[PDB]
Amino acid sequence: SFSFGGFTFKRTSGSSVKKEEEVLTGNLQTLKIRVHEGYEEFTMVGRRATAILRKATRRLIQLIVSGRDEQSIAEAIIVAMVFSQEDCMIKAVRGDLNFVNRANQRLNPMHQLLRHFQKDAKVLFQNWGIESIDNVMGMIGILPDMTPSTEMSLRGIRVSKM
Ligand SMILES: O=C(O)[C@H]1[C@H]2CC[C@H](CC2)[C@@H]1Nc1nc(-c2c[nH]c3ncc(F)cc23)ncc1F
Ligand SMILES: [Br-]
Ligand SMILES: [Br-]
């Protein structure tokens, strides 16, 4: 078990190895991240949302989420998008150079990224991508404005209807 973003993560299948990599954020800062390489599935358990996250190397494959309300679901989706380590999430960082502003505090870069997007996820959601969805009974899309859609969704994301 490990906690991230206030969700308890448990790997339910697969495996990964860690490759240290320097990535360039949207505001041109460098982070040294432990990139997980391989196919994995995780459960995410929160107080107000639960999800199943299937991913590969720097790629969200599927996120199925259920939650108390749109804000709780969005909270789970932000964490999953950061945890994915996707390039479009890295490139969505904007604003003050506040990863650079911290030198000898030697903070965890994945925690820095999540804390950044917890301030304002609009650019993260607008740059993630949307796709057309199959009509799966009990499941619905969620758009970048966090409204439901039966026809389109944020890429790889589906909501299991309360
Ligand atoms: O510093 C780390 O590497 C920590 C922080 C940032 C993400 C996880 C939770 C906090 C990470 N811890 C763990 N990650 C992982 C892990 C497996 N696949 C992953 N893919 C992406 C990722 F991002 C983390 C992981 N497994 C065990 C862990 F214990
Ligand atoms: Br890291
Ligand atoms: Br469209």
Author numbering: 322 to 483
From the paper:
RdRp of IAV is highly conserved among influenza viruses. Host five-prime cap binds to the PB2 cap-binding site, then PA cleaves 10–13 nucleotides from the host five-prime cap and PB1 synthesizes viral RNA.
The dissociation constant (Kd) of pimodivir binding to wild-type PB2 cap-binding domain was 2.2 nM, which corresponds to a Gibbs energy of binding of −11.8 kcal.mol−1. Stoichiometries of the complexes were close to 1 (one pimodivir inhibitor to one PB2 cap-binding domain). There were ten water molecules bridging pimodivir to the PB2. All of the active site water molecules had favorable binding “free” energy in the pimodivir:PB2-WT complex at the PM6-D3H4X/COSMO2 level of theory. The largest difference was found for W5 of VX-787/PB2-WT (difference of 1.66 Å).
